[PDB]
Short mmCIF file of C-alpha atoms and ligand atoms in Angstrom, two decimals:
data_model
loop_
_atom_site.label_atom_id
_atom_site.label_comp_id
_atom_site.label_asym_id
_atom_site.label_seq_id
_atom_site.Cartn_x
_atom_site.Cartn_y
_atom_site.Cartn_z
CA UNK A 7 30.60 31.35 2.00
CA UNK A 8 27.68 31.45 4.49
CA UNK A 9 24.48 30.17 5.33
CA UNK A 10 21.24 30.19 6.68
CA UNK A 11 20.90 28.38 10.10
CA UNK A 12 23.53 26.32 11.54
CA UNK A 13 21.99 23.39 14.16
CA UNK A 14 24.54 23.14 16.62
CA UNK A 15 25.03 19.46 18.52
CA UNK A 16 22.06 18.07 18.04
CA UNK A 17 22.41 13.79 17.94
CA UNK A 18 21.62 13.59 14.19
CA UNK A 19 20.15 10.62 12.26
CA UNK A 20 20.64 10.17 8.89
CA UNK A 21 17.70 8.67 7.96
CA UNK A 22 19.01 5.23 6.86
CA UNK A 23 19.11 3.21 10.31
CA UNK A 24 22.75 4.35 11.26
CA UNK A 25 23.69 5.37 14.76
CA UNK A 26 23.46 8.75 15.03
CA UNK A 27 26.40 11.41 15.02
CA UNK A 28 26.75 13.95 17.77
CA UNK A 29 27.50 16.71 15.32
CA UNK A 30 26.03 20.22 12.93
CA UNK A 31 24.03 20.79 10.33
CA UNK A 32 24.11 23.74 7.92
CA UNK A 33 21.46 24.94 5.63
CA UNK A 34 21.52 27.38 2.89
CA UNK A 35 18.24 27.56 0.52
CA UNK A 36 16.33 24.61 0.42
CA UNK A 37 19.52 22.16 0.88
CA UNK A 38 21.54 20.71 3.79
CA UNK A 39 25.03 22.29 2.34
CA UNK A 40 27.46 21.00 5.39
CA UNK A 41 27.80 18.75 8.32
CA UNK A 42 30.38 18.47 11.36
CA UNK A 43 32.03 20.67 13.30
CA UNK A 44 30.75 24.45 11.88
CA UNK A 45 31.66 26.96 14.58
CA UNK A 46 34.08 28.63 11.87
CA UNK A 47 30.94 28.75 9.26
CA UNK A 48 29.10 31.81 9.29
CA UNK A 49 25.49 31.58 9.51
CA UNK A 50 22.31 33.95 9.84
CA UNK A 51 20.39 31.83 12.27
CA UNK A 52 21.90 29.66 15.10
CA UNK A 53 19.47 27.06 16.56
CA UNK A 54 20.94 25.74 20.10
CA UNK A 55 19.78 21.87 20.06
CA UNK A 56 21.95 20.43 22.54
CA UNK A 57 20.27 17.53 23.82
CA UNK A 58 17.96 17.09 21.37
CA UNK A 59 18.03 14.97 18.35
CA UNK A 60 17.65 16.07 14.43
CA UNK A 61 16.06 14.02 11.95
CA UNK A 62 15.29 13.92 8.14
CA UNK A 63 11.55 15.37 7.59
CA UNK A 64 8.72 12.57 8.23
CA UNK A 65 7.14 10.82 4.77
CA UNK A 66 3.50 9.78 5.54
CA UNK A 67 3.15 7.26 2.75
CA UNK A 68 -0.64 6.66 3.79
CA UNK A 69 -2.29 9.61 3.39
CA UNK A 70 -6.04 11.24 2.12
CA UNK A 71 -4.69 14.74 2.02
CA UNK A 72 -5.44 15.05 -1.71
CA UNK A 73 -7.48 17.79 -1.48
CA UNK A 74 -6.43 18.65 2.21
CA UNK A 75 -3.35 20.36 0.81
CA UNK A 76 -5.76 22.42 -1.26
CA UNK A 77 -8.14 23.62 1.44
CA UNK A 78 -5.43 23.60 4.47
CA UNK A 79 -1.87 23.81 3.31
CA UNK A 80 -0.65 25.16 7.03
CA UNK A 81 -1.61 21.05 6.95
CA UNK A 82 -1.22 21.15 10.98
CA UNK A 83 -1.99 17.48 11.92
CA UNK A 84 0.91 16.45 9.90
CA UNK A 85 3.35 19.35 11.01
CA UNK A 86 2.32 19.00 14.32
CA UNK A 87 4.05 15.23 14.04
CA UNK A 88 6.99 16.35 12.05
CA UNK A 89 5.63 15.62 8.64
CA UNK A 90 6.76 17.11 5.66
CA UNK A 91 5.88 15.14 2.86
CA UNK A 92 2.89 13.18 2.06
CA UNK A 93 1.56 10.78 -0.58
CA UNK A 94 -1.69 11.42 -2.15
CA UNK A 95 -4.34 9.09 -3.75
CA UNK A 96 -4.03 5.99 -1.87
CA UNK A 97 -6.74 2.95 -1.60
CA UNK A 98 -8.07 3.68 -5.13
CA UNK A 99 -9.19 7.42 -5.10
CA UNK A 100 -7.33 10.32 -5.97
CA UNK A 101 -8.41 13.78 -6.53
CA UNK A 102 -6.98 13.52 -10.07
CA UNK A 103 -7.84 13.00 -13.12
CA UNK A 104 -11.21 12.88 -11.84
CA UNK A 105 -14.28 13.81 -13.72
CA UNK A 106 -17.84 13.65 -12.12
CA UNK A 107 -20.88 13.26 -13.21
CA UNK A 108 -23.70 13.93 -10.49
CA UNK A 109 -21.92 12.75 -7.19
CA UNK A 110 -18.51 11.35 -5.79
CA UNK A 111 -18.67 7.50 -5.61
CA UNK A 112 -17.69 5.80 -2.09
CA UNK A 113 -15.03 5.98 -0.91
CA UNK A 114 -14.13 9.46 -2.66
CA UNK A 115 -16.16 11.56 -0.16
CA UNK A 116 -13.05 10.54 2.28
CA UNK A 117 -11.08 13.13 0.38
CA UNK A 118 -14.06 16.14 0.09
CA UNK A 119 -17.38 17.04 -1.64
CA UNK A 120 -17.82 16.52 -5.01
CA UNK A 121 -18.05 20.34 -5.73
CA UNK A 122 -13.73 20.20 -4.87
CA UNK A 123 -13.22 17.79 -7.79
CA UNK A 124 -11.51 20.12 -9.99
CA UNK A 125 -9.40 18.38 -11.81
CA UNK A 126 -10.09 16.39 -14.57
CA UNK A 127 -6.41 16.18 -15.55
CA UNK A 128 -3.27 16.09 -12.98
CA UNK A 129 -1.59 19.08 -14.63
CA UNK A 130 -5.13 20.46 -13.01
CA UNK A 131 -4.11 19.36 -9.79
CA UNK A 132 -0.99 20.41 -10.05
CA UNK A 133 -1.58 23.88 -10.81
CA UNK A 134 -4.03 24.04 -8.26
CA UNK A 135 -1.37 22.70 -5.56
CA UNK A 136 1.14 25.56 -6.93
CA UNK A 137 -1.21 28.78 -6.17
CA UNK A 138 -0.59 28.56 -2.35
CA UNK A 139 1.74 25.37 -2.69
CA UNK A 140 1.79 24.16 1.34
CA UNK A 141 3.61 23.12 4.51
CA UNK A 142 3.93 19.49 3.08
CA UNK A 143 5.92 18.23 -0.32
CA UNK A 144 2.85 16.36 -2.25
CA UNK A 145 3.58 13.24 -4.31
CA UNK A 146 0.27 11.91 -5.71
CA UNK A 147 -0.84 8.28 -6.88
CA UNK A 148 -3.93 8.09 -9.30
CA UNK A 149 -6.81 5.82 -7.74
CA UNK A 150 -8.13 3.08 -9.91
CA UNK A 151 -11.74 3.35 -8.48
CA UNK A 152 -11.14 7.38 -9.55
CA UNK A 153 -10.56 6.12 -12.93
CA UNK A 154 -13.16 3.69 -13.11
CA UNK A 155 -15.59 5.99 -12.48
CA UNK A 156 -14.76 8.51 -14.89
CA UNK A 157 -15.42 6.09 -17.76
CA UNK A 158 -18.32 3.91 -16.12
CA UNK A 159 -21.44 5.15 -14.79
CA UNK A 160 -22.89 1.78 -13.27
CA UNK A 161 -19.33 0.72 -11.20
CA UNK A 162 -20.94 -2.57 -9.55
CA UNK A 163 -19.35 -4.62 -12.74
CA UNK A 164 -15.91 -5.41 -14.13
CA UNK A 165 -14.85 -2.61 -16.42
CA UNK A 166 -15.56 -3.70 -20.35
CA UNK A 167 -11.98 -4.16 -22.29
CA UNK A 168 -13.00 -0.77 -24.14
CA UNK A 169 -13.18 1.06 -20.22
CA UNK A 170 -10.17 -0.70 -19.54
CA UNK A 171 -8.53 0.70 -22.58
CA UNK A 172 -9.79 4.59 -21.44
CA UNK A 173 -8.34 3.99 -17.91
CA UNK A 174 -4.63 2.98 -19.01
CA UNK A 175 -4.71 5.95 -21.61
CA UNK A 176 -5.79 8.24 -18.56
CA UNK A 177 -3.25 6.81 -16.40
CA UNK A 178 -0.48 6.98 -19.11
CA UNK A 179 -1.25 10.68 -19.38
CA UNK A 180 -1.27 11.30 -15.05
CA UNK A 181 2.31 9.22 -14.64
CA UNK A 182 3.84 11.72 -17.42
CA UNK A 183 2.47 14.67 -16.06
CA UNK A 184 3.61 13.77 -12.47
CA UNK A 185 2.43 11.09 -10.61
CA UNK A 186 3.90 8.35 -9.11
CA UNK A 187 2.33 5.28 -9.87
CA UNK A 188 -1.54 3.48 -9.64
CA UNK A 189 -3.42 2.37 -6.16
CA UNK A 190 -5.88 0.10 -6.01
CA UNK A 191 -8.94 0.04 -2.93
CA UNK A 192 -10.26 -3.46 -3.98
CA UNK A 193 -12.34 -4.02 -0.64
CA UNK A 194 -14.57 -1.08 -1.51
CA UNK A 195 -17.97 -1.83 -3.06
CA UNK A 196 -17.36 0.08 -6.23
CA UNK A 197 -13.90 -1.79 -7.34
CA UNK A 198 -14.60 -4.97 -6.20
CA UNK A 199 -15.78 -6.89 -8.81
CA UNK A 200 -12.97 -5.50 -10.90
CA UNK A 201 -10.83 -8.44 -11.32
CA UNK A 202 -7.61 -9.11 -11.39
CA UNK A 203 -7.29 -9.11 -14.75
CA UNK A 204 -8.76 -5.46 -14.70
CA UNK A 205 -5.76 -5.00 -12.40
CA UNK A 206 -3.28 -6.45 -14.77
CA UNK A 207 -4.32 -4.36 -17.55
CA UNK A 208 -2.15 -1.57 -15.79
CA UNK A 209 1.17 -3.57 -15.30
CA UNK A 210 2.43 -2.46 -18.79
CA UNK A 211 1.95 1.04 -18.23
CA UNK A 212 3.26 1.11 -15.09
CA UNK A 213 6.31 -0.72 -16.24
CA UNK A 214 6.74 1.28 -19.01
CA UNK A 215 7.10 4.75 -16.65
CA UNK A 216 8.84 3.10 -14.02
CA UNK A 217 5.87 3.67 -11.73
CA UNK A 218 4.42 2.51 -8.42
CA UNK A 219 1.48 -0.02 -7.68
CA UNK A 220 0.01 0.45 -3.92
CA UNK A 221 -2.77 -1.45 -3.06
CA UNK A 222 -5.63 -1.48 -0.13
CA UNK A 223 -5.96 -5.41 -0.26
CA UNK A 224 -9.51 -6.99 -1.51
CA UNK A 225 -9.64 -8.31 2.24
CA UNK A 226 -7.57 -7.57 5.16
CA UNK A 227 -10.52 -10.52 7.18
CA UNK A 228 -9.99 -14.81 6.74
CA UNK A 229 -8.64 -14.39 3.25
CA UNK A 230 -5.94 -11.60 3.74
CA UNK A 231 -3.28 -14.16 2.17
CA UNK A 232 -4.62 -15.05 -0.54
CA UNK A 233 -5.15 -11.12 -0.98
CA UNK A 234 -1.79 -10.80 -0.83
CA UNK A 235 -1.24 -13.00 -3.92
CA UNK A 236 -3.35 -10.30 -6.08
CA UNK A 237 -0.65 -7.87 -5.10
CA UNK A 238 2.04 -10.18 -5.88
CA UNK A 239 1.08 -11.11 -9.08
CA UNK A 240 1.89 -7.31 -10.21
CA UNK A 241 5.43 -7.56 -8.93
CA UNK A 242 5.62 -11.32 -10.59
CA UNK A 243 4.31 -9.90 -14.28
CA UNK A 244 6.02 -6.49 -14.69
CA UNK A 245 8.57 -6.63 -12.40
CA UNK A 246 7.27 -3.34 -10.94
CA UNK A 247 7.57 -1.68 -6.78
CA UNK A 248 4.41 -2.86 -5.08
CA UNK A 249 3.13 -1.56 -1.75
CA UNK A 250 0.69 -3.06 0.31
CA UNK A 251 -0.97 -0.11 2.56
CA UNK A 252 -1.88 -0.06 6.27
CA UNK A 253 -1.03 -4.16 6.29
CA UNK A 254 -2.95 -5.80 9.35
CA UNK A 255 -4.54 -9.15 9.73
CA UNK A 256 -8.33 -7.43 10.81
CA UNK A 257 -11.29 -9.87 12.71
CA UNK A 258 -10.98 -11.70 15.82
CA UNK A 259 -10.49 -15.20 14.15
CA UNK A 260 -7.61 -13.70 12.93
CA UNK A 261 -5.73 -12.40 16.01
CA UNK A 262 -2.29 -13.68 16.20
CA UNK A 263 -1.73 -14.26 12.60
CA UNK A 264 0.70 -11.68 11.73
CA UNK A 265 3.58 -14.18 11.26
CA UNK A 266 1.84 -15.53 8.92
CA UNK A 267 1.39 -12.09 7.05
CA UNK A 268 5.12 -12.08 7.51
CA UNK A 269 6.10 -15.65 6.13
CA UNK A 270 3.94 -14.83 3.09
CA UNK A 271 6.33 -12.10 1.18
CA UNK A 272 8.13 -15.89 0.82
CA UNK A 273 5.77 -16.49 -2.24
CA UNK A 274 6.77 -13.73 -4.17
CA UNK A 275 8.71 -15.64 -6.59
CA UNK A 276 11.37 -13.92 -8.55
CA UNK A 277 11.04 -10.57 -7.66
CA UNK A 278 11.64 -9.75 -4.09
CA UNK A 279 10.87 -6.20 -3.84
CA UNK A 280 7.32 -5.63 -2.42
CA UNK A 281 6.87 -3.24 0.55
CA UNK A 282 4.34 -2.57 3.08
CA UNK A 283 3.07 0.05 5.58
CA UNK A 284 1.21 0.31 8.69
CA UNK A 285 -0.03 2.75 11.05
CA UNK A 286 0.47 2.32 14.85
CA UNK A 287 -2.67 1.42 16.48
CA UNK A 288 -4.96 -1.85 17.40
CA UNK A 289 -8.06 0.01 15.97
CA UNK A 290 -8.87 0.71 12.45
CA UNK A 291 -11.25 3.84 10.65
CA UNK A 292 -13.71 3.83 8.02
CA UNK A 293 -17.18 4.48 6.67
CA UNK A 294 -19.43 2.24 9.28
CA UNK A 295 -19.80 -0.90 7.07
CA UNK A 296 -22.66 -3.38 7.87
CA UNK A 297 -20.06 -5.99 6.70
CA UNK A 298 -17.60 -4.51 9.57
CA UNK A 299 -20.53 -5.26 12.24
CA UNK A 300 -19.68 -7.43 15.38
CA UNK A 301 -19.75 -7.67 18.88
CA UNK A 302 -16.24 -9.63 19.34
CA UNK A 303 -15.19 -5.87 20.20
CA UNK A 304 -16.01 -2.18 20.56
CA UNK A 305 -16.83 0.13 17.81
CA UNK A 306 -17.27 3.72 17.91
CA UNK A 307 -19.62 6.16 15.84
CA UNK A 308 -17.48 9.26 14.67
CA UNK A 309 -20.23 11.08 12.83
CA UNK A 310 -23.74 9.93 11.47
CA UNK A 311 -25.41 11.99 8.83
CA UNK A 312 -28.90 10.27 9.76
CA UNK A 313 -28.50 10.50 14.16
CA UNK A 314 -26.12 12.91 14.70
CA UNK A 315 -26.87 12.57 18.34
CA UNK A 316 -25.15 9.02 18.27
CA UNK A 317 -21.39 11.12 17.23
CA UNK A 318 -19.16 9.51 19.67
CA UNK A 319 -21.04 6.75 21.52
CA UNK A 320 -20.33 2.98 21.29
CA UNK A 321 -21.91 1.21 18.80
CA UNK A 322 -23.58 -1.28 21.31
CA UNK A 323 -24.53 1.48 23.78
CA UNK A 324 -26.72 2.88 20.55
CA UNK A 325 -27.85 -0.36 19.80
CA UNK A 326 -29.09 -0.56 24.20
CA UNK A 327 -30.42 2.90 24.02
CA UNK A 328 -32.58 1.80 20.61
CA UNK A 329 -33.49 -1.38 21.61
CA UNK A 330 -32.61 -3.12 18.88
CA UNK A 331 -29.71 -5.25 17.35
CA UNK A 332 -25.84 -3.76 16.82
CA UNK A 333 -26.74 -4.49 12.78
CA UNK A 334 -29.87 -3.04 13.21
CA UNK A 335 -28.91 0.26 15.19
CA UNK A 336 -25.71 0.19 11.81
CA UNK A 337 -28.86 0.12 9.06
CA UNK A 338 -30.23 3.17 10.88
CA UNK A 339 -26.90 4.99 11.33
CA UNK A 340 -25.95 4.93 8.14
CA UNK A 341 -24.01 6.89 6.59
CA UNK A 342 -21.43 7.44 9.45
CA UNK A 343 -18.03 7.31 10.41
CA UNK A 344 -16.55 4.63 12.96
CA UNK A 345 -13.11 3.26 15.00
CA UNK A 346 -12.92 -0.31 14.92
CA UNK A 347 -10.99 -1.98 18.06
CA UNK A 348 -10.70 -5.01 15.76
CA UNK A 349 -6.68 -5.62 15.44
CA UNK A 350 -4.70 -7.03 18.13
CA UNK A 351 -1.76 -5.27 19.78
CA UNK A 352 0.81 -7.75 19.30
CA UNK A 353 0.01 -7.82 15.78
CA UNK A 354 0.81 -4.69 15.33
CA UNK A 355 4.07 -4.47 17.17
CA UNK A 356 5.07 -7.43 14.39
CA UNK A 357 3.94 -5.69 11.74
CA UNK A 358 5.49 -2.23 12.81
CA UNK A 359 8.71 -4.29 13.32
CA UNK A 360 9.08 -6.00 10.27
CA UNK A 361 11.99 -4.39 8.55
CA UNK A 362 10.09 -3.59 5.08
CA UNK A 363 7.40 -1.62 7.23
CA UNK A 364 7.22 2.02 7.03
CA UNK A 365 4.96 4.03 8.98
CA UNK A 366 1.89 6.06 7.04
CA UNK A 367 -0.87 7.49 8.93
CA UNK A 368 -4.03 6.51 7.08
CA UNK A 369 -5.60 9.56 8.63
CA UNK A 370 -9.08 10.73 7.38
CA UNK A 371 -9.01 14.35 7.53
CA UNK A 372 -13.09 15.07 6.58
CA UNK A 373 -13.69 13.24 9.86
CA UNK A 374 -15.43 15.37 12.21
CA UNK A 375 -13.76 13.04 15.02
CA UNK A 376 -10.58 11.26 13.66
CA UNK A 377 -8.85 8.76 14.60
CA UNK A 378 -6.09 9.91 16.37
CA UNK A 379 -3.74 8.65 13.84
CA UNK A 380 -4.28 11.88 12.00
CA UNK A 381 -2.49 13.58 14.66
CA UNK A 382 -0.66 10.80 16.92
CA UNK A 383 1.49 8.51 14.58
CA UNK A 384 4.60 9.02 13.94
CA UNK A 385 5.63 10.41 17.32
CA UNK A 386 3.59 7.86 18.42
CA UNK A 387 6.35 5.35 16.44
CA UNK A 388 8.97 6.90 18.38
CA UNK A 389 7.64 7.65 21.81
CA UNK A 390 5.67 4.75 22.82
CA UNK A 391 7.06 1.95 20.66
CA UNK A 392 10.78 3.01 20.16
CA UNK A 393 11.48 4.78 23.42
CA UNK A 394 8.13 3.16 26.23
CA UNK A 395 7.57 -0.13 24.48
CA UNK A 396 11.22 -0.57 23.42
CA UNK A 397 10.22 -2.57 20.25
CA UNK A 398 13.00 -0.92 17.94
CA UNK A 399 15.60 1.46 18.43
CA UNK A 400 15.13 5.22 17.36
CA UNK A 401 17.31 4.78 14.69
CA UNK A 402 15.30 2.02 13.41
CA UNK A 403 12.05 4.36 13.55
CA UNK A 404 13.31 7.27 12.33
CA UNK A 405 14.48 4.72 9.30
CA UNK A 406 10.93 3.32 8.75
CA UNK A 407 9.61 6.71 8.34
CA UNK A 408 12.51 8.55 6.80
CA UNK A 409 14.92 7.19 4.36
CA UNK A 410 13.41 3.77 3.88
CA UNK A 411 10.25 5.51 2.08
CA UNK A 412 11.99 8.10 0.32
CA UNK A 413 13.73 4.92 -1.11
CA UNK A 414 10.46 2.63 -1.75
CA UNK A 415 8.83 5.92 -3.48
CA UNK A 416 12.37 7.03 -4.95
CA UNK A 417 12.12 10.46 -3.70
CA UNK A 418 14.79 12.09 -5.14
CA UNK A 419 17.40 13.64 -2.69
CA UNK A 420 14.63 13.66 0.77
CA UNK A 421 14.66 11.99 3.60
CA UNK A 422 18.60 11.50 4.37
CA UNK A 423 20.65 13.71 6.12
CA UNK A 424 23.50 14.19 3.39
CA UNK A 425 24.82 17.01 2.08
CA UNK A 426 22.96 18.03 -1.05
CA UNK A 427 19.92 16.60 -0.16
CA UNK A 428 16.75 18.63 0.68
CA UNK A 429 16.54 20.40 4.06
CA UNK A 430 13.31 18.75 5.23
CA UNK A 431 14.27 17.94 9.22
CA UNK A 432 12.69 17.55 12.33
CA UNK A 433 14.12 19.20 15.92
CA UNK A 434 12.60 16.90 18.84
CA UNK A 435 13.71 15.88 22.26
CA UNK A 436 13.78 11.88 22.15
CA UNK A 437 12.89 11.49 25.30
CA UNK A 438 9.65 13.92 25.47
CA UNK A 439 7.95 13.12 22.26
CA UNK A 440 5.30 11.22 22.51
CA UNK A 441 1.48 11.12 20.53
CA UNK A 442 -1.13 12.99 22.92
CA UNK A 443 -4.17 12.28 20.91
CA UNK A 444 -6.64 9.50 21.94
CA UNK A 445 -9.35 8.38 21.12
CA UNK A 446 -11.79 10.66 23.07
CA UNK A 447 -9.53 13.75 22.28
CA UNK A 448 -8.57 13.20 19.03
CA UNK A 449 -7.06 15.92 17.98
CA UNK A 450 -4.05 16.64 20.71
CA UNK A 451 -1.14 17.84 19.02
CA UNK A 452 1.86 15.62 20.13
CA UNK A 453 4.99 16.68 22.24
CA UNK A 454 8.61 16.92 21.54
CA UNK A 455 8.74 18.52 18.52
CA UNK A 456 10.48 21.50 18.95
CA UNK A 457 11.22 22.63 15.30
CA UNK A 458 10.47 21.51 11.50
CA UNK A 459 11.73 23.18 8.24
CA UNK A 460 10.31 21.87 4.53
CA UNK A 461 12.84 22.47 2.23
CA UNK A 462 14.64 24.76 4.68
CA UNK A 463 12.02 27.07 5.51
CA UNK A 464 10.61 26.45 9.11
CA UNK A 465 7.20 25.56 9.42
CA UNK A 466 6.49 24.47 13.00
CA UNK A 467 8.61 26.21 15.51
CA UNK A 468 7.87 26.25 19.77
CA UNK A 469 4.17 25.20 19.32
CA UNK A 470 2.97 27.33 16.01
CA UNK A 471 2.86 25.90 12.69
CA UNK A 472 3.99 28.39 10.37
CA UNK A 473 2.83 29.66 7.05
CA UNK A 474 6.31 28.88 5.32
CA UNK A 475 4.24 27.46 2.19
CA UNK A 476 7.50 25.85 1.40
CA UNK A 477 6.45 22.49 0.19
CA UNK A 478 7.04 21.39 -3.68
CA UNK A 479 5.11 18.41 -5.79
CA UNK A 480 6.87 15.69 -6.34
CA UNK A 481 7.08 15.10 -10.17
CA UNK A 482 7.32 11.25 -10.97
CA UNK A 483 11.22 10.36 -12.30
CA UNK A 484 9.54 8.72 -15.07
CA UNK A 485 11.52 5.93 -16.78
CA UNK A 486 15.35 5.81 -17.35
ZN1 LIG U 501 -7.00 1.70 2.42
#
């Protein structure tokens, strides 16, 4: 007969793009058990949200947060933003199954230090994740350049057919004991000269579990498109749910060209079913990358192991103060951190507007100085481009970050407002919230949100996050 908390007349969104309902919203456990009318219900907890507007709980479908879960499950950034899920192992690395031998190959030190690298099965993971569990639902991918270098110790090759057998029997073994599908980083040094056959040799595993493929293209530069066939070809020969991450068109002779990112899900052939994501900014983040070097725009040191004097100066600022070339003062750098201010805004608004677009983050969380997407991007999604910039309605955003990517990542019963479903929500005043991180202060919680519960135990309330530790991985479905 009763419940938990009752959220009385808030403007609720489903999730699924629909107008929203001025109405209530009951939860008992972890479920959303009514909604309507509820004054005759009797609940515990009454949460007065007149005026404000209640949404299903934020997916980031970009994240690094393997091992952040692990080491910080009050996971604050994403909280902060309304996020209650995330998905793990992106761009080829995952913290599972992961086996190393004297370090952690680039790009794995994006997740943590090689002494965190625990698991040499996912069941590992898993178990790990369940001691504390955390303020975020975790649904992990397994990183190709993870498995490539648990069976390869020189990674600057194509995989032999014998490696390639090891990997799909690894990955075989991660899908059934949880996770969601493959990713592939094919940019990065140590997968690149996998080819695409390397690629392929996946398909029939994945098909087999019903599992994902996500992909951080080979290049995102001159040759994005033809990138994009690599990730098409997947969808073409197993008929399996491809995701291109963080999709952009990246270098100044390509400004201008996302239409033509657009027009080219046209080639897919018979399958029509490839997705994408994107975070919301004109400036990217990674390792600095002497490949990356330029002067057609600014980029930004974030941390240097070698000059960490140089943290959070301009790239050709360093270069003045050395006297020597932009390249150069990069050799010297090295290794470091660095922002890119190499997309172009309108871009982005067409990418972030493209109906199969959700929004992940793609926040680095072992950055000493992060982007601010780790802590600005989805209310940045609904406070400067929905509600400022006027580029799509709220119900459209709250869509491309709700129910469309519980769908793409078949998430079962999260991210719609429907009785019976999970009670991951968000509480937020639409016309407040807004991103307050930048890229000087980084780190700026956003505004708006007033309330979050994970699977109906709150976890941010009135400016705390809260130690509700009521998050749950997110076991694959597996095949029929
Ligand atoms: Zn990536």
């Amino acid at each position: 007969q009763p419940v938990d908390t009752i959220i009385y007349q808030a403007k609720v969104f489903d999730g699924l793009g629909n107008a929203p309902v001025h109405m209530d919203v009951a939860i008992k456990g972890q479920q959303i058990v009514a909604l309507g009318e509820l004054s005759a219900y009797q609940a515990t907890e009454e949460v007065n949200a007149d005026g404000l507007c209640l949404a299903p709980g934020f997916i980031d479908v970009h994240t690094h947060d393997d091992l952040e879960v692990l080491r910080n499950p009050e996971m604050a950034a994403k909280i902060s933003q309304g996020v209650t899920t995330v998905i793990t192992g992106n761009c080829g690395i995952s913290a599972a199954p992961a086996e190393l031998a004297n370090d952690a190959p680039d790009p794995m030190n994006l997740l943590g230090e090689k002494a965190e690298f625990k698991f040499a099965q996912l069941r590992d993971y898993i178990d790990a994740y369940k001691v504390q569990k955390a303020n975020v639902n975790v649904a992990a991918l397994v990183g190709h350049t993870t498995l490539r270098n648990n069976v390869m110790a020189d990674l600057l090759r194509p995989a032999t057919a014998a490696e390639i057998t090891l990997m799909q029997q690894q990955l075989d073994l991660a899908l059934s004991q949880g996770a969601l599908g493959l990713s592939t980083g094919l940019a990065y040094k140590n997968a690149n000269q996998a080819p695409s056959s390397e690629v392929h040799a996946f398909g029939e595993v994945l098909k087999k579990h019903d599992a994902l493929y996500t992909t951080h293209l080979r290049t995102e530069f001159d040759a994005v498109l033809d990138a994009m066939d690599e990730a098409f070809a997947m969808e073409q020969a197993f008929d399996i749910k491809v995701i291109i991450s963080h999709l952009k068109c990246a270098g100044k002779n390509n400004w201008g060209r996302a239409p033509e990112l657009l027009a080219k899900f046209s080639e897919q052939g018979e399958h029509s079913k490839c997705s994408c994501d994107a975070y919301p900014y004109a400036a990217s983040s990674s390792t600095l990358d002497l490949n990356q070097v330029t002067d057609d725009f600014d980029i930004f040191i974030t941390w240097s192991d070698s000059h960490p004097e140089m943290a959070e100066q301009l790239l050709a600022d360093i270069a003045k103060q050395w006297g020597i070339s932009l390249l150069d003062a990069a050799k010297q750098l090295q290794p470091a951190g660095a922002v890119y201010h190499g997309l172009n805004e309108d871009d982005v608004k067409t990418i972030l507007a493209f109906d199969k677009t959700m929004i992940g983050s793609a926040g680095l969380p072992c950055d000493p100085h992060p982007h601010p997407r780790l802590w600005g991007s989805f209310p940045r999604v609904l406070g400067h481009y929905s509600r400022e910039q006027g580029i799509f309605s709220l119900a459209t955003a709250i869509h491309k970050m709700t129910g469309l990517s519980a769908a793409n990542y078949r998430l079962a019963n999260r991210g719609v407002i429907k009785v019976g479903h999970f009670a991951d929500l968000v509480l937020f005043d639409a016309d407040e919230i807004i991103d307050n991180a930048t890229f000087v202060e980084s780190a700026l919680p956003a505004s708006g949100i007033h309330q979050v519960w994970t699977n109906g135990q709150t976890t941010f309330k009135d400016k705390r996050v809260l130690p509700a530790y009521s998050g749950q991985f997110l076991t694959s479905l597996g095949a029929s």
